[PDB]
Structure 1
Amino acid sequence: MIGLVGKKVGMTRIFTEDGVSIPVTVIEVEANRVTQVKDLANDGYRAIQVTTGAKKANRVTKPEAGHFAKAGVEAGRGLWEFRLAEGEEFTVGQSISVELFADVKKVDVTGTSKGKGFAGTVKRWNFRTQDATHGNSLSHRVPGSIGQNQTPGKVFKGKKMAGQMGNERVTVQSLDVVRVDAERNLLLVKGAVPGATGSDLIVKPAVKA
């Protein structure tokens, strides 16, 4: 089934009456406004394109403005697409709200993880550090060997090395839905989700269940 686009508000706890603390992530899910419906005949597949939030009228270009005007909806801060199953249908201009998840109890949350910059092999790939003492020469956190010898004669593609870490799209699967609060546009899921505070989150019903 489709999902909704929200933003990571932060993280807190919920105390249950039987003395259990549930670490929850607070996701603010405003109304998602359908801006385009893609169908098999015209686009080759079935999906809806949604928008959410708001954007400053000076920051929206007339290409984007014209695209929004065709749907007859207000400008949002972006556009996302959701693949449609066989059953459901939607109409352009329709708004979808958080009570979509009223009876779901597992979600998959996708976001852009925090960017770690250029990271070494110890941090990025959990490589073991070498000896801190006992004669070690300038080689406390270096990767060590990277290949065999003349017989391969090259470094194998996909070798684990230092480089960019984080700042990439990550999905976390099968999160408990703790609370759906329609009037506050809030969704509370158990556990941590990728991304820093204030970043966009894509919430979908769990695919594996």
Structure 2
Amino acid sequence: MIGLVGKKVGMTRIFTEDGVSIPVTVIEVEANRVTQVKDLANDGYRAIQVTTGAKKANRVTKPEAGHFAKAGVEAGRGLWEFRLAEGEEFTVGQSISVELFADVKKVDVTGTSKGKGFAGTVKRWNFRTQDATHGNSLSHRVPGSIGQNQTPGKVFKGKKMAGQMGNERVTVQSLDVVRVDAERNLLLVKGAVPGATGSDLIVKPAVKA
């Protein structure tokens, strides 16, 4: 089954009658509108290409606006693409609402994580700091040793070192969907999804069930 493209509005809590506070992540899901249907005869696979949101008319380019004009649909802020299962099809100018998740129970939310910048191995790879006293010379947060002596004159591939942390695609699996509010285009999932506030989210039904 396909997913929908939303946006992280923020987090809040749903007080049940029983006295339980459910930490939820509000995901507004506007009308995803299809722009292209891909198939086996032309594209080798079955998928749809959707768009959501709006865009400035002076900023949407002539190739992109011609691509939306062929589908006959308003330009959105992006283009995403969802693989189709069998027995599942959609038309081109079709709009897809959040009622698709009306009877799902768990979703997988894919987002782009927050940018931690250039991070050290303590933060990134959870390395232990060395001793803050007892003689330590300028070596409190360094990674320590990185190899062995002459046997493989070389550091191995994938050695855990410092570098860019975050700002990348991650997927949180098996999030309990709490509420599907079709009237104001919302989706409340239990827990914390990746991404900052106002960033794009991809909500798909859970594959692991």
Distance in 1 separating the partners of 2:42 and 2:141: 55
Give the deviation of 1:145 after TM superposition. 0.3
Distance in 2 separating the partners of 1:109 and 1:84: 18
% identical aligned pairs: 100
Q: Is the partner of 1:34 in helix, strand or coil?
A: strand
Deviations 1:95-142 (A, max 9, x none): 000000000010000000000000000000000000000000000000
Distance in 2 separating the partners of 1:89 and 1:157: 44
Distance in 1 separating the partners of 2:63 and 2:43: 20
Give the deviation of 1:82 after TM superposition. 0.2
Q: Is the partner of 1:67 in helix, strand or coil?
A: helix
| 1:11 corresponds to | 11
Q: Is the partner of 1:164 in helix, strand or coil?
A: strand
1:110 aligns with 2:110: yes
Distance in 2 separating the partners of 1:119 and 1:78: 30
Q: Is the partner of 2:65 in helix, strand or coil?
A: helix
| 1:22 corresponds to | 22
Give the deviation of 1:177 after TM superposition. 0.4
Deviations 1:155-185 (A, max 9, x none): 0011000000000000000000000000010
Distance in 2 separating the partners of 1:177 and 1:142: 42
Deviations 1:70-96 (A, max 9, x none): 000000000000000001110000000
Q: Is the partner of 1:192 in helix, strand or coil?
A: coil
Distance in 1 separating the partners of 2:139 and 2:59: 51
Q: Is the partner of 1:42 in helix, strand or coil?
A: coil
Deviations 1:30-71 (A, max 9, x none): 000000000001100000000000001011000000000000
| 2:101 corresponds to | 101
Give the alignment's TM-score, normalised by structure 2. 1.00
Distance in 2 separating the partners of 1:87 and 1:27: 28
Distance in 2 separating the partners of 1:174 and 1:58: 40
Give the deviation of 1:20 after TM superposition. 0.2
Give the deviation of 1:202 after TM superposition. 0.2
Q: Is the partner of 2:42 in helix, strand or coil?
A: helix
Give the alignment's TM-score, normalised by structure 1. 1.00
Q: Is the partner of 2:144 in helix, strand or coil?
A: coil
Q: Is the partner of 1:86 in helix, strand or coil?
A: coil
Distance in 2 separating the partners of 1:131 and 1:24: 40
Structure 1 runs of 4+ with >6 Å offset: none
Unmatched segments (≥5 aa) in structure 1: none
| Superposed counterparts of 1:72-111, under 5 Å | 72-111=72-111
Distance in 2 separating the partners of 1:198 and 1:11: 11
Distance in 1 separating the partners of 2:45 and 2:103: 27
Give the deviation of 1:191 after TM superposition. 0.2
Q: Is the partner of 1:59 in helix, strand or coil?
A: coil
Q: Is the partner of 2:122 in helix, strand or coil?
A: helix
Distance in 2 separating the partners of 1:87 and 1:19: 43
